[PDB]
């Protein structure tokens, strides 16, 4: 089930503004986060916006959500998370 599998994902930083707005939408406050915190609020955002497939809860259908605009994706799988990590490398600054 979604948060269970989300928690299994592999990977202090100031998110760029498009990502920051997504994190604030998920209940995050301020601008300075650990990667652990960033991943946690991304999961919370995905859960409150119900972007995951009820049937296939590793699939996130993020298209025509600002998260899909940010990722440049219609979708990603938590089983093949490379596109999320591509966006995180572009959108977290030390
Ligand atoms: Mg702060
Ligand atoms: Mg979590």
């Amino acid at each position: 089930y979604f948060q269970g599998s989300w928690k299994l994902l592999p990977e202090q930083v100031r998110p760029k503004l498009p990502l920051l707005k997504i994190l604030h939408a998920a209940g995050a406050q301020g601008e300075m986060f650990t990667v652990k915190e960033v991943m946690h609020y991304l999961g919370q955002y995905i859960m409150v916006k119900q972007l995951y497939d009820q049937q296939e809860q590793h699939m996130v259908y993020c298209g025509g959500d600002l998260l899909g605009e940010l990722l440049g994706r219609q979708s990603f799988s938590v089983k093949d998370p490379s596109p999320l990590y591509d966006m995180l490398r572009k959108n977290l600054v030390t």
Side-chain angles (χ1 to χ4, degrees), residues 18-75:
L19 177 55
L20 191 49
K21 284 170 171 183
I22 288 165
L23 298 184
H24 286 358
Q29 286 159 121
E31 183 173 297
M32 210 52 35
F33 298 111
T34 62
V35 180
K36 189 179 161 44
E37 287 169 356
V38 166
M39 297 295 295
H40 171 64
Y41 286 111
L42 281 177
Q44 297 293 105
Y45 179 89
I46 289 163
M47 287 181 279
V48 69
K49 300 299 293 281
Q50 301 267 263
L51 296 189
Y52 66 90
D53 187 342
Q54 309 259 219
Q55 269 26 73
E56 292 299 341
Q57 295 195 9
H58 67 277
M59 291 291 337
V60 176
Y61 290 115
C62 53
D65 188 276
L66 278 306
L67 171 59
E69 170 158 349
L70 215 215
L71 294 170
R73 295 286 297 190
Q74 301 286 9
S75 73

